[PDB]
Design an enzyme around this catalytic site. Sequence first.
Site, PDB file in Angstrom:
ATOM      1  N   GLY A 137      49.926  78.670 -44.579  1.00  0.00           N
ATOM      2  CA  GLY A 137      49.490  77.390 -45.109  1.00  0.00           C
ATOM      3  C   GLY A 137      50.557  76.689 -45.923  1.00  0.00           C
ATOM      4  O   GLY A 137      50.679  75.465 -45.870  1.00  0.00           O
ATOM      5  N   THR A 138      51.339  77.455 -46.689  1.00  0.00           N
ATOM      6  CA  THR A 138      52.443  76.876 -47.448  1.00  0.00           C
ATOM      7  C   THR A 138      53.463  76.247 -46.512  1.00  0.00           C
ATOM      8  O   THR A 138      53.634  75.024 -46.487  1.00  0.00           O
ATOM      9  CB  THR A 138      53.097  77.943 -48.324  1.00  0.00           C
ATOM     10  N   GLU A 247      76.024  63.736 -36.457  1.00  0.00           N
ATOM     11  CA  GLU A 247      76.443  63.915 -35.074  1.00  0.00           C
ATOM     12  C   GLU A 247      75.487  64.839 -34.327  1.00  0.00           C
ATOM     13  O   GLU A 247      75.206  64.614 -33.143  1.00  0.00           O
ATOM     14  CB  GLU A 247      77.865  64.464 -35.038  1.00  0.00           C
TER      15      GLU A 247
END
Lengths: 433, 434, 428, 31, 49
Positions: A137-138, A247
């Site tokens: 969840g974090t 780039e």
Amino acid sequence: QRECISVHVGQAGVQIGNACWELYCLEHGIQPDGQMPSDDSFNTFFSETGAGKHVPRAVFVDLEPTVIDEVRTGTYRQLFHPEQLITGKEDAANNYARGHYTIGKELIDLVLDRIRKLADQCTGLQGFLIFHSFGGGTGSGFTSLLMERLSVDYGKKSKLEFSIYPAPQVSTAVVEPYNSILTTHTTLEHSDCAFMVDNEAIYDICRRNLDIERPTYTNLNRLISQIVSSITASLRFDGALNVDLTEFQTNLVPYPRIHFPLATYAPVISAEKAYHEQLSVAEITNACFEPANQMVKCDPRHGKYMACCLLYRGDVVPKDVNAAIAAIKTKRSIQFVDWCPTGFKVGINYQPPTVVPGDLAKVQRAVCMLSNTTAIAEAWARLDHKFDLMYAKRAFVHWYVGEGMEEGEFSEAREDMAALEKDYEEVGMDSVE
Amino acid sequence: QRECISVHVGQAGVQIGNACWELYCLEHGIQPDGQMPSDDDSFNTFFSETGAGKHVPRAVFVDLEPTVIDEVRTGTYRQLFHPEQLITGKEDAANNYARGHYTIGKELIDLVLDRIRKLADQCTGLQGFLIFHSFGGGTGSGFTSLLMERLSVDYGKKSKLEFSIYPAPQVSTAVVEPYNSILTTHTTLEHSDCAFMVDNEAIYDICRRNLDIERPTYTNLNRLISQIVSSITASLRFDGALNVDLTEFQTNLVPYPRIHFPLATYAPVISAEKAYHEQLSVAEITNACFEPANQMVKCDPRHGKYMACCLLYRGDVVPKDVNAAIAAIKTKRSIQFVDWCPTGFKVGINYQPPTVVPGDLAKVQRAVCMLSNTTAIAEAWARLDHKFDLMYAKRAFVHWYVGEGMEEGEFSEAREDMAALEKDYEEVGMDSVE
Amino acid sequence: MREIVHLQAGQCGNQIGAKFWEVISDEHGIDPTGTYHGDSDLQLERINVYYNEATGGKYVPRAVLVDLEPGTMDSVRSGPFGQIFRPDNFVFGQSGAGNNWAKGHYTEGAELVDSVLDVVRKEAESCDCLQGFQLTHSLGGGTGSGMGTLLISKIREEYPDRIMNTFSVVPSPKVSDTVVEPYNATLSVHQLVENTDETYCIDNEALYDICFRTLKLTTPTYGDLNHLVSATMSGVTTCLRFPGQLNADLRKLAVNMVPFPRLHFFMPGFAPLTSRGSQQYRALTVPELTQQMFDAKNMMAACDPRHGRYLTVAAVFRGRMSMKEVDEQMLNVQNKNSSYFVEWIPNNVKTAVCDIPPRGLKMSATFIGNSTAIQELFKRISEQFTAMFRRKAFLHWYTGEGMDEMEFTEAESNMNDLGNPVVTRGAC
Amino acid sequence: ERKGSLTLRSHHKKYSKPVLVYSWNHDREAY
Amino acid sequence: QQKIKDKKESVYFSNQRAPLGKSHDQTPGLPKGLDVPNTTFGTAIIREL
Ligand SMILES: Nc1nc2c(ncn2[C@@H]2O[C@H](COP(=O)(O)OP(=O)(O)OP(=O)(O)O)[C@@H](O)[C@H]2O)c(=O)[nH]1
Ligand SMILES: Nc1nc2c(ncn2[C@@H]2O[C@H](COP(=O)(O)OP(=O)(O)OP(=O)(O)O)[C@@H](O)[C@H]2O)c(=O)[nH]1
Ligand SMILES: Nc1nc2c(ncn2[C@@H]2O[C@H](COP(=O)(O)OP(=O)(O)O)[C@@H](O)[C@H]2O)c(=O)[nH]1
């Protein structure tokens, strides 16, 4: 001058950061304390304060303790600034609702205040590298919120993601399709380039090429740390084709939405497997395009490469890479899309890859191959199928909808991924007009 | 520049190659470890130049069963071979051609071709492939056929020769040699450009009546086979007046696109306390080649006509006692030829004297391996054909193949292709009357 | 005298120009410390073409070094001839070009171009008779393609009567070192074609064919490649730098190789090129110099002269030499492969002889070709642009920096309006 | 946003003695 | 020490070909005195002239 800011969210992000920084300190010469035993290569990832005690440009934020406490209790305690290490008091518990809505707000102001403070002593900021998974969840909800707020506040800056792709066969959670589907739906509009890294394929390459039948996440994160150090090598040292994050952004992704490259590494070879090889540029280029050194479990010959960015590190002659790419572009197993006759972004650095005390070998050459391809469509579609079967009779929906999320976000995410699959098919289709 | 890749399949192929690479490492200055001790390009054919001179070979040793390659990786030459050019299986082919082509084997053919791909990639001029199989088992028959098929598909037009051990006329070891041999010959008769045979009982006789040892074993046989293979590939390694190449063998020894089956005959097989007493001149060692007891296959050449011979002299062989001896053999009326091929005796001479492994052979300054394509081997093919007929008259040993997954009907086209080979041999043996 | 203002754009241009200020510095005897340690008094007589002077005999180059990223700049400063340039002239900028021609031309490139023009105004006002500006740049990528063509446009606008030389590298067919090289090359050439007077297309694959076939090297580096570039890029300005018979400056090189203002794309070539294995077996004379000039191996552009007709050949020879050889040998060439030279231009070959060879040689020559063979390069880049532009690919960053759809189509139409005159000359 | 020496300018260069300038005749006269 | 003798008695097994955080106890498959942290790998570039 040419610096980048690292964010580490989740269990995966924190331990990837652990491996990355213990690689970077050995790469530069910085001891775990911070003092270098004794000129400007450090400046990109390591800031410098008084009495020469070099500090990383990293924000380690995780919503639950003891994982940051390993970092601030162990050997690398005196390297990190403790106000970078941001801890909550409640685990997000594999819920994107708890990562994005309820316990994201008590900590998002603190982590954004610290991100702004590290932006303060940054003259030319190049961008962010945010490290997470598509699992817990974090590392789902908090990184979704971080990408939203960072796109709000630093919208002109390059933001790149290092995301641990959910393992297509074993898994470590049963709500991984929900969490992954939500975090990629809400980071699709803000992320510029999302490097996919799998777990199944790194297990397979650790068994086959690294010769360890018993690998741990320390070895797994060390391989991913070598990937991160390989792409962020031109910002650190000098080289032939000095390549930039902007780039990477302009090469690794054709369209506004098709921005999920796959990372591979060559010399993944393990001491009693490289005394018997020349380790020449041609064969280390072939090892990237072989369908076993892929670090995301999708088969490349069931697809077409859109764009390949090759990062050669160490003693590489600037033109055996020419011979190798010439040999690659005549073969038939590697298929390019018809709208991209050009296919390669070559970068060369003169710094050899350092060896950590551990798994890998002291090799004079390395190459990190970042490929945007159409073969990731099957990888997305299989978790879309996993979502459809798990969501067809409303499994695990009550935690998500009762913590604060509305119901319609699931349908919006599923429609967004139907659009993403349709985009993959449209791009992969050849030309007849 | 001039390199070729060796594939060693089956227990017979792995042991043959063990004694082989045992010979080549002392051919050059390569230790059992691999570095050259203390302080020109001859290593390139069979060895590479991995940094600080480790000299790893160009062999891709395969076995569908364990322990045979495991002795190699935990004995003497364990440091010289790369750990992933030695591929092992976790089961057995078990004398079952169907369990070399299907079931076990198709899970391993991917890794085998991948390692072959890597070694082929680190080669500039890849002269050919060298498959060392056995015609008798499952590992050296079915996996050999699958390998031959996929190798022919991916790396085409390249010369691909087999150095095989043809089944004994009477002796044998197993019981399903007819089935296995006919099946793999049927499958690998249209892909292998050439295939030399040696026979176990013939080596037994040549080591019992020349080498003076009355109890030889597999090491003793494999050293002579290694000398044959080294005499074949020595011109590709060292310098001589008439260099002979693998493609040159592949054109000279084989008349017809199906008749690609020569027989080896190595000469000076003298036994240490017999070698100081002969002149060991070129004429008598050529007579030793064409004498029908030094043949390395138990198949009497007087029952047939010679088709093409490749003589490979090595040592201090003057170029044209070769001329005199070949004319002398041509004048003899019992070494008979086909009327359509007057040019028969092909000369390759190398300035490399033979090198002796500690064992049975002696210090000889001249040596030859005469390679005969002849129509005498039609008799051996006919006796294996008759063994297959007696086998299949009542469907013995067919249940293992059918329950594996080989179709019941495959024996029929194997039989038909063997009958076709018999007809081609009898048609090429006849004199021209038109 | 006639000064030549040197300009570096891009990482490729900076490294090529760094090898340039290696090669002509140790030609003109300028040491790394900046003083003069030479042998002959003849090599300081035209020192006022590439080096301004300071107090105490410090000979500083008139080179303006431009890059959007301050790391190639530090590499040049840390290089061998790094403490030779003006420290104020190191015009850097803390930004990111990111290989986008839009990000080099319509953005912070256009923000830094004002300071770039200020220091070129420095270096061009501190003069008396300016002849030309040379720019070293890469058609692929950004910076050198982005601010490079912008610099061409502004410089030609505010000094309209001076020669522009653009030593440009072009993408090769075998590889591509950036996936947006077709876009950048098209947008670069579209601005090059109504501006410049002399371009020099130098291809990396042609450089490797030279280095592997003729020079017989196994590990060519970028010092190797840009030194091969710097040989011709020094040799073109030698009649203007050193005395000789038939002196020819850059301006009459322009009038002799430009029949029409669009057709000014040149294939360079330097040809006393000897392998080390055959140096002792070499027989260096003008006939073999031309026979090694005109074979289809030593032009630094990867496009085949056997697939078109030359419009103009130029040869700037260096060394004390008899030019009856030169005249008879170029006449033998013109009547030998006559069908490969255009019939409507009689004597389409120019000769310019300098007395003084480059140091280490007795006999050298640079060869400049305006030929039909640039058509293959143009059609290849046009095919790549059509293929990647038909489905709008790699294009939204071009749009998001302030572009329009019509600019790309105008550039493609200008590419085809280059392809048409170079194929009309193939059929007269 | 000027940087030091790019505020200071001239319209004529000064050359050392062994440099062929325009006024080579003019100064070599008076040497 | 009871655990050290336990693992010393237990290093006779598949534990040596599958160590918990190592590869093979790699040393018998290298030359005798070699200094594995040193000795960079592969073929270097000769760089003649
Ligand atoms: N490199 C590395 N990856 C990890 C580690 N732990 C977990 N992962 C990956 O992360 C996934 C689940 O952990 P996370 O998504 O990071 O969990 P989280 O982001 O911390 O969120 P919470 O579960 O609420 O604590 C797994 O499927 C792994 O693929 C680790 O220790 N190292
Ligand atoms: N020269 C030589 N011939 C051998 C050796 N081993 C076996 N052979 C011959 O091979 C025949 C059967 O052995 P293989 O064909 O190698 O059996 P395999 O490859 O192990 O196949 P499986 O028995 O199914 O495992 C015998 O009749 C022998 O004539 C050997 O070590 N050296
Ligand atoms: N000759 C030569 N060419 C170079 C060198 N460095 C780079 N290049 C070429 O420059 C191209 C890419 O440079 P580019 O991306 O334009 O650099 P940028 O302008 O700073 O973005 C590559 O295709 C290289 O072939 C060099 O040192 N010498």
